[PDB]
């Protein structure tokens, strides 16, 4: 499970960069899913059903692999249909250079409301502009949200 995380992080993404990632809050510069190759993925990949779910590395057939995404056949099967009868609304992850990627559609970034985002362990790293956000309970499915 844990070694299904893609560790394809660039050298430029060092601990100093990660320290100042959720440290930038004291701010003028703020705001179709398929097969994603694991070579361009740094960190866990999250999809939202609207509840957050981790999608680990697999081969192209969908069989899970456990080699830190180091293999060149490792991908993330993120194909999605709307989650009343499908799997998830969309997904979010950080790529090798440190940019947050999205795909699919938000559950209503992964925004429930125009001001509230689904809360998940990597929210503060993937979306630093939401560090001053407050956490509220949501029942849509019992999950937590982060709002202004």
């Amino acid at each position: 499970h844990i070694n299904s995380t893609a560790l394809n992080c660039n050298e430029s993404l060092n601990t100093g960069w990660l320290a100042g990632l959720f440290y930038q809050h004291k701010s003028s510069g703020c705001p179709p899913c398929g097969i994603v190759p694991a070579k361009s993925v740094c960190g866990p990949v999250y999809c939202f059903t609207p509840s957050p779910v981790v999608v680990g590395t697999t081969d192209r057939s969908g069989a899970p692999t456990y080699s830190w995404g180091a293999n060149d056949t490792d991908v993330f099967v993120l194909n999605n249909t709307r989650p009343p009868l499908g799997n998830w609304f969309g997904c979010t992850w950080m790529n090798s250079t440190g940019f947050t990627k999205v795909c699919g559609a938000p559950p209503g970034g992964p925004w429930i409301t125009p001001r509230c985002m689904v809360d998940y362990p990597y929210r503060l790293w993937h979306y630093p502009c939401t560090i001053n956000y407050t956490i509220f309970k949501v029942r849509m499915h019992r999950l937590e949200a982060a709002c202004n």
């Epitope: 059903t49 779910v53 981790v54 999608v55 680990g56 697999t58 057939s61 969908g62 069989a63 899970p64 099967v77 194909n79 999605n80 249909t81 709307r82 989650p83 009343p84 009868l85 499908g86 799997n87």
Partner: antibody, heavy 119, light 115 residues
């Protein structure tokens, strides 16, 4: 293609666990549903599990007494139905559906497991 | 959220060998989904065998399914049509919908061949 557990006789109030094994020996990018058919009734969809990611969804009629697990390394999905009533006597199928979700139905089926709930 | 009901007619479809047959499936709610697809499917069950999908998404034929089968319709009316009926086509035909929670199967139509 989808080997299924054998037929079973279970007394009312007990619980029965039915296994579903893909002939690959490994789980891939597909969803696994459980459909049953009681005598004189139409096909009834019970639940859904993605053995790769772990998401499980259950139908409201069975919410509370059905539990669908998946054991990797063994590559065998399970369905457990507790609090067995007399009308749970049915043929239980596991069915493979698309990873992307329900909609297109089920492209592959197990043979079926006949569970007889009787004393 | 309102209960969806699928109705199949007829319930028994006797057809002489070599003649066309059609089975209709009607839904109380439209089956177009958020993604614009219409998720109505068709399944053929033989004696002592699990069901087998013939058509997915109204009209897309499944692999190995004989060309004699075809689906049509939209919204709430759908039709499974067989051009030339063969002895192999005996059994029960179901429709299913995947556009409303939870997924449900039609009542089933029993086709018998008149020889």
């Amino acid at each position: 293609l989808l080997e299924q557990s054998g037929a079973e006789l279970k007394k009312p109030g007990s619980s029965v666990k039915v296994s579903c094994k893909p002939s690959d020996g490994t789980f891939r990018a597909y969803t696994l549903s459980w459909v049953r058919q009681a005598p004189g009734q139409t096909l009834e969809w019970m639940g859904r599990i993605m053995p790769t990611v772990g998401i499980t969804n259950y139908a409201q009629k069975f919410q509370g007494r059905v539990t669908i697990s998946a054991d990797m390394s063994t590559a065998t999905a399970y369905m457990e139905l507790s609090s067995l009533r007399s009308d749970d006597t049915a043929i239980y199928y596991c069915a493979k559906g698309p990873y992307v979700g329900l909609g297109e139905g089920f492209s592959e089926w197990g043979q079926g497991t006949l569970v007889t709930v009787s004393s | 959220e309102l209960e969806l009901v699928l109705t199949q007619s007829p319930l028994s479809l006797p057809v002489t060998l070599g003649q066309p047959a059609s089975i209709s499936c009607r839904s109380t709610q439209s089956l177009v989904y958020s993604d614009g697809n219409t998720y109505l499917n068709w399944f053929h069950q033989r004696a002592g065998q699990p069901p087998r999908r013939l058509i997915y998404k109204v009209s897309n034929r499944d692999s190995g399914v004989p060309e004699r089968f075809s689906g049509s319709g939209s919204g709430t009316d759908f039709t499974l049509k067989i051009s030339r009926v063969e002895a192999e086509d005996v059994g029960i035909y179901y429709c299913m919908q995947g556009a409303h929670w939870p997924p449900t199967f039609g009542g089933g139509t029993k086709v018998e061949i008149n020889r």
